[PDB]
Structure formats: C-alpha cells, structure tokens
Design a protein around this ligand. Sequence first.
Ligand SMILES: O=C(O)[C@H]1O[C@@H](Oc2ccc([N+](=O)[O-])cc2)[C@H](O)[C@@H](O)[C@@H]1O[C@H]1O[C@H](CO)[C@@H](O[C@@H]2O[C@@H](C(=O)O)[C@@H](O[C@H]3O[C@H](CO)[C@@H](O[C@@H]4O[C@H](C(=O)O)[C@@H](O[C@H]5O[C@H](CO)[C@@H](O)[C@H](O)[C@H]5NS(=O)(=O)O)[C@H](O)[C@H]4O)[C@H](O)[C@H]3NS(=O)(=O)O)[C@H](O)[C@H]2OS(=O)(=O)O)[C@H](O)[C@H]1NS(=O)(=O)O
Ligand SMILES: OC[C@H]1O[C@H](O[C@H]2[C@H](O)[C@@H](O)[C@@H](O[C@H]3[C@H](O)[C@@H](O)[C@@H](O[C@H]4[C@H](O)[C@@H](O)[C@@H](O)O[C@@H]4CO)O[C@@H]3CO)O[C@@H]2CO)[C@H](O)[C@@H](O)[C@@H]1O
Ligand code: A3P
Ligand code: CL
Ligand code: CL
Ligand code: CL
Ligand code: NA
Ligand code: NA
Ligand code: NA
Ligand code: NA
Length: 670
Amino acid sequence: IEEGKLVIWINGDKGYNGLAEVGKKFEKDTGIKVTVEHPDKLEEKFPQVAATGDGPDIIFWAHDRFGGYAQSGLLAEITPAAAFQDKLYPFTWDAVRYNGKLIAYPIAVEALSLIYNKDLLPNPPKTWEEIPALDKELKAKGKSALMFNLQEPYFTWPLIAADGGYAFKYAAGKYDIKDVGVDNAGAKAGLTFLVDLIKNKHMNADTDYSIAEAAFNKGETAMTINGPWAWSNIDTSAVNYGVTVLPTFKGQPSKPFVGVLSAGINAASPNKELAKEFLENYLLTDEGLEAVNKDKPLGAVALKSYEEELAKDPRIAATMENAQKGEIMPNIPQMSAFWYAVRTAVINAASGRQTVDAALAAAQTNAAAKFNFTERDLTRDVDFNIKGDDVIVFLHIQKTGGTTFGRHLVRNIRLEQPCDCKAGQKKCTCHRPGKQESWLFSRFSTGWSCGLHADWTELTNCVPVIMDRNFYYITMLRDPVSRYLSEWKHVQRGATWKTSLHMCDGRSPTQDELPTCYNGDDWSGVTLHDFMDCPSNLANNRQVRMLADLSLVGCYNLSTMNESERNPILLASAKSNLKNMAFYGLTEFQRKTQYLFERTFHLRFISAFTQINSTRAANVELRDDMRSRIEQLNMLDMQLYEFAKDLFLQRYQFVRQRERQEERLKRREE
Ligand SMILES: O=C(O)[C@H]1O[C@@H](Oc2ccc([N+](=O)[O-])cc2)[C@H](O)[C@@H](O)[C@@H]1O[C@H]1O[C@H](CO)[C@@H](O[C@@H]2O[C@@H](C(=O)O)[C@@H](O[C@H]3O[C@H](CO)[C@@H](O[C@@H]4O[C@H](C(=O)O)[C@@H](O[C@H]5O[C@H](CO)[C@@H](O)[C@H](O)[C@H]5NS(=O)(=O)O)[C@H](O)[C@H]4O)[C@H](O)[C@H]3NS(=O)(=O)O)[C@H](O)[C@H]2OS(=O)(=O)O)[C@H](O)[C@H]1NS(=O)(=O)O
Ligand SMILES: OC[C@H]1O[C@H](O[C@H]2[C@H](O)[C@@H](O)[C@@H](O[C@H]3[C@H](O)[C@@H](O)[C@@H](O[C@H]4[C@H](O)[C@@H](O)[C@@H](O)O[C@@H]4CO)O[C@@H]3CO)O[C@@H]2CO)[C@H](O)[C@@H](O)[C@@H]1O
Ligand SMILES: Nc1ncnc2c1ncn2[C@@H]1O[C@H](COP(=O)(O)O)[C@@H](OP(=O)(O)O)[C@H]1O
Ligand SMILES: [Cl-]
Ligand SMILES: [Cl-]
Ligand SMILES: [Cl-]
Ligand code: NA
Ligand code: NA
Ligand code: NA
Ligand code: NA
C-alpha cells in the first residue's frame, strides 16, 4: 500500500465508475490519486492480504463481513465527530458497530424486492403459492413466471426465513452462535417450496445471476428477484418494470436479510486520515452519493439529506418495505460460515441430489461449526502386545512438544522391562522381553532412521522395511499460531532441520521444488516478518503437510496442480490419517493426553504429565493483525486443529464417561 495514494475495493455489481468520479474530484481538489478496483472474491481476498501489507486502503462490502474483519484486527476504528454521525441514520451506524466500536462507514441500505415486467404482468402475484399457476399460463405463451439467482443463498434466504428459518438466535443482548435456525420446520417448508418449483419445472436449479438477469432483461420471464444495483441494466434494456413487495409464503412476508453497504478502512493503511476525508467529505455528500447512485443505484442511502431527496422513488419505497419485513444481517464473524453452509445446502437440495431434510441438517452442523463423529471414531482400544509383534511409531512434528512426549515414552512408562536409558546418553534401548527387537520407533529409541522428523509419507513407506506387524502410529498436535511462533523462535536460534530427506514418490525434492528460505548455514536472527515472508517456509501448515499422503498432490512439485485442488486434498488426507491413528495428543492438554494414551494402550505412566504454560510462544506479544496473518499462512493447520481438538475432547469425554459407568456398575454389585 503506497502512502499518499488511495486504493479502493468495491464489488463488481456496484457503481464503481461513479465512485471513480468521486475519486477524480478528490484528486482534483487534493492531488491525491484514488484508484478504484473490483477484484473477484474481494471479500475473501481482503482477510488474506490485509493481514500482510497489500490490500486496499478502503474496502466496500455489506456490513455482514466486517465483524469478522474487525475480530481479526484488520479494520481501523472510525472516529467521526458527533456532527458527522448525526448526518447519517442511527439504524445504519448500528449495522457497523462491533464490540462497542464503529468499524466502518455505512453508505446505503439494500434489500431484495420482487421486480416485474408490466408488459407481461401488470399486477404481480402477492403469494409464492400462486406462482406455479401463473407460470403455467405464461409457458403457454412461450414465457416463464420467475427467474432469479439460485446459486447465492442471499436470494433464496427470504423464502427460507419466511415461515421461521433464522441464522443465529438473538438472545440476551447477543447472537447465540450455537442456536442456528437453518433446519427448523419453517426453514424446511421454505426450501421445500423452492425445491418443488424446480421439480415441477417452474424454475431451473442451474439458474444463476447472469442467466436470470439475461432472461428478465430480454422479456423472457415476467419477474425476477434482485437489489437496487440491478435497476440500471434493466433501464439499459428499456424494460417497463415495477419494483414491489416480495410475495408472501404461508401468509407471512418474505424476510430478506438486509445489508448495509459499508466502507471500512484497512488497519494497515498509512492513509487513514485521507481515507476518512474521502469518505466523510467527498463520498458521503449529496454529490458523492449521486455520482455513485447514477451509475448503479444504492438503494436507501444512509445520509439523511440525500435519502430525503430520493425517498419519493417508488423503487426505493418498495426497497424499504421489503427491508422492514426482513432482518438486518448480524455482523458477527460466524456469518460467513452460516452463508457457506446454506449456499451448499440449497444447491444440493435444489439439484434433487439430497433431500431438503438432509441438506439442511448438514447446513445446521456446518453453520454451528460442529463435528459429528462415530463411536468407532471415538473408540481406540489397542490390545498392545509388547511381547508380540506390535510397534508404536511416534511421528514427531516439530514444535508440538514432542521432546517431552518422546521422553515420556522411553522414561516414564511402567513396564516389566522398561526402556534402558543410560545416564548421559540421548537414546534408550526399548526392547521386548528377552529379545533384541524394538517395540518403539522414535527419535529416542531407534533414532531418526527414516530421516530427521520423518513425516507420515516417509514413515509409512520406510518403517515397515527398516524393521523386517501391527504398527500403531501416534503423534502430538499444537495450536498452529503457537506452534508456528515456536518454530520461528527455534529457527531464529539456529534450527534448520536441513538434513531432513522430505522423501516422497521415492526421491527428495529438487531445489526448484523446495527453495531454501535463507542464505548461508542457517536463518538465525530472522525477524517474524522475514520468517513470514518466505513462500517456501516449511513452517507453513506443517502439521497438515506432515500428516498428509503427499503423493496425492504430486509431492513437493507445486506445478502439478492448482492450490484449489491441492489444499482440500491435503486437509482431507491429514484428517483421515490423524483420525485413523491409534492415538494422538494435544500439547495444551497434557493430562488428558496422558489419560487417553494410558486408556488406549492399557499402560500407565510413572509420573504424571504436567502443563507448562510459560512457553516461548506464549511470551511473544502478538498484535491481532499479526496473529491473523499467521492464521492465514497456516489456514490448513487451523482447520486440522479445530477438527483434532474436537475429536480429542470428544474422545476424552467418551472414555472418561465409560470408565465412570464401569466403576459404578462394579459398586452396584458390592
Ligand atoms: O563409524 C564410522 O564410519 C566412523 O569412522 C571413522 O573412521 C574410522 C573408525 C574406526 C576405524 N577402525 O579401524 O576401527 C577406522 C576408521 C571416522 O573417523 C568417522 O567420521 C566415522 O563416523 C561416521 O559414521 C558414524 C556412525 O554412523 C557417525 O556417527 C553417528 O552420527 C553422529 C552425528 O550424526 O553427529 C552422532 O550422532 C549423534 O549426534 C547427532 C548430532 O547431534 C544426533 O543427530 C541429531 O539429532 C538431533 C535431535 O534429535 O535433537 C537433531 O536436531 C534437530 O532436531 C531437534 C528436534 O527438533 C532440534 O531440537 C534441533 O535444533 C535440530 N537441529 S538441526 O536444525 O540442526 O537439525 C539433528 O538434526 C540430528 O543431527 C544423533 O541422534 C546422535 N546419535 S547418538 O545419540 O546415538 O549418539 C554419533 O556419533 C553417531 O550416531 S549413531 O550412529 O550412533 O546413531 C559419524 O557422524 C560419521 N562421520 S562422517 O564424517 O562420515 O559423517
Ligand atoms: O466458495 C463459495 C463462494 O464463496 C464466496 O461467497 C461467499 C461470501 O464470501 C460470503 O461473505 C457470503 O456472501 C454473502 C454476503 O456476505 C452478503 O452480504 C450477501 O451478499 C450480497 C450483497 O449483500 C449484495 O450487495 C449483492 O452484492 O449481492 C450479494 C449476493 O450475491 O449475501 C452473500 C451470500 O449469498 O457467502 C458467500 C457464499 O454464498 C465467493 O465470493 C464466491 O465467489 C464463491 O463461489
Ligand atoms: N508439558 C508441556 N506443556 C506445554 N508446552 C510444552 C510442554 N512440553 C513441551 N512444550 C512446548 O513444546 C515446544 C517444544 O516442542 P518440540 O519438543 O517438539 O520441539 C516448546 O514450545 P516453545 O518453543 O514455545 O517454548 C515447549 O515449551
Ligand atoms: Cl539418530
Ligand atoms: Cl488436560
Ligand atoms: Cl486401561
Ligand atoms: Na549411538
Ligand atoms: Na527445543
Ligand atoms: Na543466514
Ligand atoms: Na503471548
């Protein structure tokens, strides 16, 4: 981001040419250039890049995305004088308040309306229920009743919400993120109605924004559902159209989710005062908003003065009627998870590939961020025969507390013949009774015989050969921000693990495949910024990479597939390999780790594990924006760890409960 310039991101359906005109007036008056851009998926890109030092100075989107950005420390708190605040409606400032603080400037209120072609349909239907009859009439005339975007849940939500669907329950002054309303009876009735429209061929599951718009603007369909921004192209096509209240469902109004177009200032912007000037003194004026509105209409604008001027527009009147009947969107971080969940459910139900009930049940789980596991997933019972052919393999991922855990395995297990650890010696002899055979494959027993910090791909391909059986793989995991910081501090004091083989498909990577991040013998002294800056840093997503089958993505050769393909493959593979291990622990839960290891393998430790809170990672003072960048660099690991933590804690609860029941049944004999 350059100082002395402004870069603005706004969505491609908004009046970006008009906004650019406002930017040119600002430049005329100040010599400060303003660049407007409309990148694809800007709302996903922003948290990915703002966290570094790219990204725009100002980001426009509906307010629902901004709580998540604010929680990650990506937005500047905005500081409008009371005089300026009174220029906009309080309704709209509420939309942009997060945890007591204002995090953007409200621009305009948007709600979906029913848009109809007066030359085909001079009185639009008041109910969804009458649409099938109407369509049958229109099809006899070579036309259809209704087409609108079925791919984005924003457009189908009004119907799903009408009879009772909700996102998050509002209770006791906040949104309850555990009380999700996507699979209740009302939600199902709404979605069932839409699925039925499609089954009876009144609508097509494939219809998206473009297809619906093209059909309406060409007079092929009598109605569409869309926002104020859409009116411009309709006027361009010279359709004679009206904008009205959405139809009712089961006698109740359609309830669109209401958005407030909002302008946030990037926390990493060196231009915060200039951004403030532009927004307050150029855009949020009658003239600024008029310039944007003339390009693509904004809806009901937040600035009282200009909102009064346009209030008489019946299109805006209908927009206000639908907005009053709907609900303002929450701005909480969990909104994007809600939307992603509903997006998928609606597509799969609409296609007929999944029933409404199953699809919404899946959305419910996802929106509430829950994990369902089978009994088999929770039950890990290993008749561990040290006398037999069983071998425990400890896959040690760097900085997960593996030195501690590995020392526990060789020093701390009560065995008839425990490991023989001679004083002042690194390794131990962990042999079966009476034999010269090892029961533990690990750094402190066999050594790094399949390579330094051999990962899942290496171990599974090397261990069986180098020991000739039942192999019981185990590992430890750590929250990724802490694990990443720990690795940065260890590298900063000389760690490189440069002798690791990184073997996959029978060879090590080439330098082109895996470039080194440092010149010279090591990366000692590196700052966190420079650590984060190397694209090929093996610290990034280390736990996923080391638990996945790397052959599935072409090993270390990043040209063999795109990131959009490679990433889901890695995550799924790591989840599967982890889940299917005999056991794993979490660094943050030392005692639960001990207990589950003991109950999995039917072993006991001599001395209790202990929790060390005062780690080197814990001592790093971490800005929220920086934490967020570390999360983004480790996003696969963040997902793996969320999964792993939940499974681990569900395993703990399951095993403890069972043990408590057993004790009790025993007492209920005596
Ligand atoms: O045996 C020979 O061939 C011998 O021959 C001699 O010549 C003759 C001998 C005899 C006769 N005769 O007539 O009788 C004639 C001639 C010749 O002079 C020798 O050069 C030659 O020796 C060669 O072979 C021997 C046997 O293989 C080698 O000795 C082995 O290896 C040594 C070594 O590699 O240094 C040494 O191993 C011990 O020390 C290592 C280094 O510390 C240990 O490995 C390290 O483990 C670290 C760890 O786990 O902590 C790891 O650290 C990294 O990860 C951790 C955890 O994440 C981080 O904390 C660290 O920060 C991180 N550091 S990093 O970022 O820098 O990576 C390290 O990476 C890893 O290197 C090793 O575990 C330890 N083994 S031990 O405990 O068992 O002792 C030993 O002497 C020996 O090991 S072993 O074979 O017994 O297992 C010798 O090196 C080799 N010399 S060479 O010149 O040919 O290469
Ligand atoms: O990978 C699947 C898709 O993911 C991406 O879309 C996501 C967004 O990132 C989420 O934020 C959300 O989108 C919401 C949006 O936040 C909300 O404001 C509303 O968007 C309206 C907008 O208010 C209005 O101004 C106008 O622009 O129409 C928008 C709807 O098209 O509703 C959205 C949900 O429909 O969820 C979506 C996933 O549905 C990514 O951008 C996609 O390209 C990708 O396919
Ligand atoms: N019992 C324990 N409780 C909490 N953290 C522990 C621990 N034993 C080790 N760790 C942490 O695990 C990291 C070392 O992992 P490894 O042995 O795999 O290199 C260190 O993190 P820090 O570097 O942040 O201090 C260390 O503090
Ligand atoms: Cl070794
Ligand atoms: Cl614990
Ligand atoms: Cl037990
Ligand atoms: Na040795
Ligand atoms: Na260490
Ligand atoms: Na160096
Ligand atoms: Na800290």
